[PDB]
Write an enzyme that holds these catalytic residues in place. Structure first.
Site, PDB file in Angstrom:
ATOM      1  N   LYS B  85       3.636  25.415 -28.785  1.00 47.63           N
ATOM      2  CA  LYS B  85       2.776  25.671 -29.948  1.00 47.63           C
ATOM      3  C   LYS B  85       1.323  25.980 -29.534  1.00 47.63           C
ATOM      4  O   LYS B  85       0.616  26.720 -30.212  1.00 47.63           O
ATOM      5  CB  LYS B  85       2.807  24.438 -30.849  1.00 47.63           C
ATOM      6  CG  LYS B  85       3.548  24.592 -32.171  1.00 47.63           C
ATOM      7  CD  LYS B  85       3.745  23.216 -32.780  1.00 47.63           C
ATOM      8  CE  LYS B  85       4.721  23.130 -33.960  1.00 47.63           C
ATOM      9  NZ  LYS B  85       6.091  23.564 -33.734  1.00 47.63           N
ATOM     10  N   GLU B 107      -1.148  24.054 -41.685  1.00 50.27           N
ATOM     11  CA  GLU B 107       0.016  23.402 -42.239  1.00 50.27           C
ATOM     12  C   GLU B 107       0.756  22.698 -41.093  1.00 50.27           C
ATOM     13  O   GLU B 107       0.747  23.194 -39.969  1.00 50.27           O
ATOM     14  CB  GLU B 107       0.827  24.539 -42.871  1.00 50.27           C
ATOM     15  CG  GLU B 107       2.316  24.505 -42.721  1.00 50.27           C
ATOM     16  CD  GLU B 107       2.762  25.559 -41.691  1.00 50.27           C
ATOM     17  OE1 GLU B 107       1.930  25.970 -40.853  1.00 50.27           O
ATOM     18  OE2 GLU B 107       3.931  26.001 -41.730  1.00 50.27           O
ATOM     19  N   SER B 375      10.962  23.766 -24.998  1.00 54.57           N
ATOM     20  CA  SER B 375       9.766  23.974 -25.795  1.00 54.57           C
ATOM     21  C   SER B 375       8.778  22.831 -25.835  1.00 54.57           C
ATOM     22  O   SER B 375       7.577  23.073 -26.016  1.00 54.57           O
ATOM     23  CB  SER B 375      10.151  24.383 -27.211  1.00 54.57           C
ATOM     24  OG  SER B 375      10.875  23.347 -27.849  1.00 54.57           O
TER      25      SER B 375
HETATM   26  C1  LIG Z   1       6.757  22.578 -32.946  1.00 54.02           C
HETATM   27  C2  LIG Z   1       8.100  22.499 -32.470  1.00 54.02           C
HETATM   28  C3  LIG Z   1       9.276  23.264 -32.617  1.00 54.02           C
HETATM   29  C4  LIG Z   1       9.703  24.030 -33.880  1.00 54.02           C
HETATM   30  O1  LIG Z   1       9.599  25.279 -33.453  1.00 54.02           O
HETATM   31  P1  LIG Z   1       9.488  26.767 -33.740  1.00 54.02           P
HETATM   32  O2  LIG Z   1       9.446  27.236 -32.359  1.00 54.02           O
HETATM   33  O3  LIG Z   1       8.333  27.117 -34.560  1.00 54.02           O
HETATM   34  O4  LIG Z   1      10.831  26.895 -34.250  1.00 54.02           O
HETATM   35  C5  LIG Z   1      10.230  23.304 -31.675  1.00 54.02           C
HETATM   36  N1  LIG Z   1      10.101  22.577 -30.542  1.00 54.02           N
HETATM   37  C6  LIG Z   1       9.008  21.766 -30.321  1.00 54.02           C
HETATM   38  C7  LIG Z   1       8.856  20.944 -29.091  1.00 54.02           C
HETATM   39  C8  LIG Z   1       8.030  21.731 -31.286  1.00 54.02           C
HETATM   40  O5  LIG Z   1       6.980  20.838 -31.053  1.00 54.02           O
END
Ligand SMILES: *Cc1c(COP(=O)(O)O)cnc(C)c1O
Ligand SMILES: O=P(O)(O)/C=C/CCSc1ccccc1O
Ligand SMILES: O=P(O)(O)/C=C/CCSc1ccccc1O
Ligand SMILES: *Cc1c(COP(=O)(O)O)cnc(C)c1O
Ligand code: NA
Ligand code: NA
Lengths: 264, 387, 387, 264
Positions: B85, B107, B375
């Protein structure tokens, strides 16, 4: 041609239109039908009726709570159209405009939504979250079913926008008096847009947002607008009197009558 | 507009007329910034020296033992803030600044987008305003304090279901009358154009880095790249650079909650229905009446009630495949990575890892070069998994 | 021994006779590994692709505004695990393996060394046994679960004051009869030789990277490098490569707790007394009777009852200067970095930042190129500062 | 030359030495003085006395608790030397060896520690956490004050270690029967070390660690060792009888007498 005749009639009277707004089913189906008849009886020239939506993102706290109250009573869209069919069977001439959010018209198919409006007697539909840039399907379906597609003319409108609104729109041009969302909380010089819209043969302008005092509707009319729409000031009265339905109606009449008088 | 607001049938610009000039302004400042070497060099500098770019690509050896699968992990968990993010927000903050704006609106659901927006704004001298559904504020205390500690104003949204859906609403309401001095820092690759395009372009590093990295480490593109899909940002950031490489499969993983069959899930792209909301035409968690519903998942971050338009489009033409993964399935992938690799993965990412584990475990003799986008970090989820 | 067990008057090898062969073995495997390109390439690989090496060097612009000070931060908070401790453990784990050992023993206080030891052992297939003073196990729940989740055996030590001191004891007790199959992964640059030398050499990356990095960014070595000193690892890792650069000042920052004057601190090097304990001759938190005492600090990680021998030596000859910083002082530095830079620093690191802020604030017109080692992340400390 | 005469006497008797161990001040100064006199009266040939330390890292649970119990009674090092002065004034010939941790001897200066030992009548000092590699200052100070510096010969000892221990040590060579820490919990073939130490004219070996049964002391003696030291088995009796001091003493005598008999 409900709006057409209403405006021609009001023009001959050198009068402006007063159009109150409420959420259908707020605070209940029955009280709402009663609220709507009181609105008309006190002098409403037309109506702007919103069907309850889960995410009214163009509305401030008052109307937000209007949708919450409706939801709490279990008012579904199907129920709204049933209510609208009855309001029409009761009042043959008054223009009925619906305040709509996009998912609700697209849900069962855009075309099927405008056909239902016709069947029921709705005169126009304003889809709050569809700009002119995205209106094509809604506009087309509305016309196909003799429903006036209402467009919002904002204060930051450029000439191309004014020219679009004037060619596509029917019934009335929704003239915003402010930026932000709906609310009698923040009070809204619209002369230029009013003259330009007139030049392009747009639909008679109806000023909306912030209109809460009779003074405000007299000024809208004085500036060249064909009338004014008031919602939160109206809904606030419903909120104020949830424990006294009779007083609600009594107060609703008082404000609408004082408001209608200001357009004469 | 300068760019196409749609990806096939999905996307659009469904916002009240008042906000259209703001989206046109934003779009134009993005196109200009994209061609501006000074901007590019500035974004690249923030990314490298402040965020930790480039992130590692970790070969998970122990985990794939006894099978013919090779698994790498995009280490987005090592970025500043603990999640991908951070890439997005830095660029959008520079965009707000390019525009002459000095106010940010954000948001947030699980609080990860809010923390990110807050740190970016602190760093770049922007005034940050963040909206959070009251139910999420009560649920996400550590992220709220972090946000507040980084100078951000946190504002609880009590309307509707008092969660993400409602926070998003409030932000657009605010923006409808503040756009002239404030920019809306949307949290994922969804919402009205130009946002899905911008978040993607600002998340591209991920897949761009994964390419050079795997090409260096294996001298071949992966057979497939897997990523979780809450809103769509981390997934499209990975997918993006591989789209024109037809041999590489793209796998989006949606949360299955307790099971699709139970209706208690967050899989709209595959088990939802196309609708129009949040300035977008896309698959959605909806009732039979078209009333917007909530997305469920053991992971708070995968609770965006819809999905990005490009994903709904990549799925439509067959470019990418979307599957789902249950709470227990994600719990198990989470557990396994901790134990065999020494990495605590976010429960969001765990859904992606869970699918890679399935692919492996199900076809253990199949030769597979897999890359899972990790992620985010899982230190966040220690308590939740514990209970 | 092959190397000098002492740094001037400090250091030594004060362990029961039974453990001497283990220290001689360890020393020799270290010297061999150090000259082994295969080991070096293996350690470098783990460091880069698994941990996130190299870490960024972040120029803090906002924070130094209105002054003639330039401040950079060694981003050790972006390493895998959230702290510099990860560098050390990876090398020591490879050392254990080189030795034919498959068992790891680890001492931990705040739980950061235990988490690190646990993730390294999980990754490299070592059986990990961790000792933690009972009072710390009750106090450090999230780290205990993390440790356990990564396969490690957590064992509460109830003897003595049931804290770090006592955990260290237990580990050496265990090691005295298990050294033949298990390696003792000491947590800092202290203890008996060859440990202070090994942890340093395995923490050298920090200062080695800071040199090339600052030379690239400023074309000059820093005027001074600042780092907190709980045990001495992160500090010596920074200092190491700058020792022969006489123009660069080295600043170690010890925890001051509620104030030196109150006796409620963790500053032995400067306000302690030389003694012999934990296989070492060095400054110590001691009673008038020579009974070992506890180290106090708002930050749990700065509670090692002594300090490294090399630091006590660098201080002795004047090479490095050691000052202290109170709880409130660290709280303020912590607060300020969050707000102006968007970085939540560990309360350990905050002591180091607090001193840099002092240097600045006190002599705002003085031209200064400063580098503070941000040894770790502060997500850990959100609750503590909150209360 | 307390150990010297004791060993010569025991050799003429073709007897082994039994050396019990306790922490001074455990469970109290007075009970401890009483425990020590009972130890001697039941047949102890020498004594190994530990002064309470905060971090006894070469000791298992039993002795750990011995230090905790002493600490709970407020036994300070100063108090220990006062106790030792009195034990000597009571018993002129028995060898008195101290079990020490490094900080306690270095605290007030290594030299000043060995001078205090002399003044008080201590015969030897074993510093548990100082290997031979680090003994120089301690060794030197001990000799300077006619204190026998005790060295630990481990089972993994190489020849150079054996040769060092034999040249530096005085009084007795502490022969470990095991790896690990003190504890009667884990029971410990030492013939080779015993013969080699003899060859280098080392101090008479005293086997320590794990010695808990009379059988064990007879075997130590049979293997060539000059005697055996027992601590945890001893201290466990103190632990077992904290609520009955009289039974403690009674039980202490029974075990020590049965243990001493095993060396004859
Ligand atoms: C913020 C968040 C998401 C949700 O993700 P999008 O990529 O916007 O689908 C997914 N993984 C992590 C670790 C997040 O913090
Ligand atoms: O409460 P007001 O008087 O400020 C305005 C009322 C008009 C209601 S109709 C309307 C029009 C546009 C967007 C949302 C709406 O609900
Ligand atoms: O409890 P044991 O019988 O196993 C051994 C007792 C000997 C006490 S003397 C001693 C010797 C070496 C290191 C620590 C000590 O406390
Ligand atoms: C582990 C720990 C320390 C204590 O450090 P030494 O470097 O061993 O003094 C300091 N900072 C952080 C962030 C830590 O986690
Ligand atoms: Na979703
Ligand atoms: Na210390």
């Amino acid at each position: 041609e409900r709006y057409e005749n209403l405006f021609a009639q009001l023009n001959d009277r050198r009068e402006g239109a007063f159009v109150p707004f409420v959420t259908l089913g707020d605070p209940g189906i029955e009280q709402s039908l009663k609220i709507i008849d009181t609105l008309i009886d006190a002098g409403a020239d037309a109506l702007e009726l919103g069907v309850p939506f889960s995410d009214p993102l163009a509305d401030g706290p008052t109307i937000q709570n209007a949708n919450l109250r409706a939801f709490a009573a279990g008012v579904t869209p199907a129920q709204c159209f049933e209510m609208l069919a009855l309001i029409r069977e009761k009042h043959p001439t008054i223009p009925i405009g619906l305040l709509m959010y996009a998912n609700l018209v697209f849900n069962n198919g855009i075309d099927a939504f405008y056909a239902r409006c016709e069947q029921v007697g709705v005169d126009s539909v304003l889809v709050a979250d569809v700009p002119v840039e995205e209106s094509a399907p809604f506009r087309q379906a509305a016309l196909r079913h003799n429903i006036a597609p209402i467009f919002i003319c904002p204060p930051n409108a450029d000439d191309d926008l004014l020219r679009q609104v004037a060619s596509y729109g029917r019934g009335y041009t929704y003239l915003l008096s402010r930026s932000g969302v709906t609310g009698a909380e923040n009070r809204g010089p619209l002369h230029h847009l009013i003259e330009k819209l007139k030049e392009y043969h747009a639909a008679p302008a109806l000023q909306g947002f912030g209109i809460s005092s009779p003074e405000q509707v007299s000024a809208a009319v004085r500036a060249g607008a064909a009338g004014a729409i008031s919602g939160s000031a109206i809904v606030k009265i419903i909120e104020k009197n949830l424990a006294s339905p009779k007083q609600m109606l009594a107060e609703l009449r008082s404000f609408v009558s004082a408001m209608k008088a200001a357009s004469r | 507009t300068l760019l196409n607001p749609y990806f096939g049938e999905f996307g659009g610009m469904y916002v009240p007329q008042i906000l259209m000039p703001a989206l046109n302004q934003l779009e134009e400042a993005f196109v200009r910034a994209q061609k501006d070497p000074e901007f590019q060099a500035q974004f690249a500098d923030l990314l490298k020296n402040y965020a930790g770019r480039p992130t590692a690509l970790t070969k998970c050896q122990n985990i794939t033992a006894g099978t013919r699968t090779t698994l790498y992990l995009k280490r987005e968990d090592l970025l500043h803030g603990g999640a991908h993010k951070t890439n997005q927000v830095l660029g959008q903050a520079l965009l707000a600044k390019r525009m002459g704006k000095s106010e940010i609106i954000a948001e947030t659901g699980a609080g990860q987008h809010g923390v990110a927006s807050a740190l970016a704004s602190a760093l770049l001298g922007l005034k940050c305003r963040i909206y959070m559904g009251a139910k999420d504020v009560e649920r996400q205390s550590p992220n709220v304090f972090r946000m507040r500690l980084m100078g951000a104003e946190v504002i609880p949204v009590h309307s509707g279901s008092a969660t993400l859906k409602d926070a998003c609403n409030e932000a657009l309401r605010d923006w409808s009358g503040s756009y002239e001095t404030a920019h809306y820092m949307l949290g994922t690759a969804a919402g009205p154009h130009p946002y899905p395009t911008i978040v993607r372009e600002f998340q591209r590093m991920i897949g761009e880095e994964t390419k050079a990295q795997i090409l260096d480490k294996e001298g071949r593109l992966p057979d497939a790249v897997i990523a979780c899909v809450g809103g769509g940002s981390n997934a499209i950031g990975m997918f993006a650079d591989f789209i024109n490489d037809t041999s590489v499969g793209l796998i989006g993983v949606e949360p299955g909650g307790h099971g699709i069959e139970t209706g208690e899930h967050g899989a709209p792209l595959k088990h939802g229905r196309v609708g129009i909301y949040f300035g977008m035409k896309a698959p959605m968690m909806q009732t039979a009446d078209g009333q917007i519903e909530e997305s469920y998942s053991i992971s708070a971050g995968l609770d965006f009630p819809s999905v990005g338009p490009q994903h709904a489009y990549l799925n439509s033409i067959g470019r990418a495949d979307y599957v789902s993964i249950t709470d227990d399935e994600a719990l198990e992938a989470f557990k396994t990575l901790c134990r065999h690799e020494g990495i605590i993965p976010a429960l969001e990412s765990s859904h992606a890892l869970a699918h890679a584990l399935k692919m492996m475990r199900e076809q253990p003799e199949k030769e597979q070069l897999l890359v899972v986008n990790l992620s985010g970090r899982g230190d966040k989820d220690i308590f939740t998994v514990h209970d």
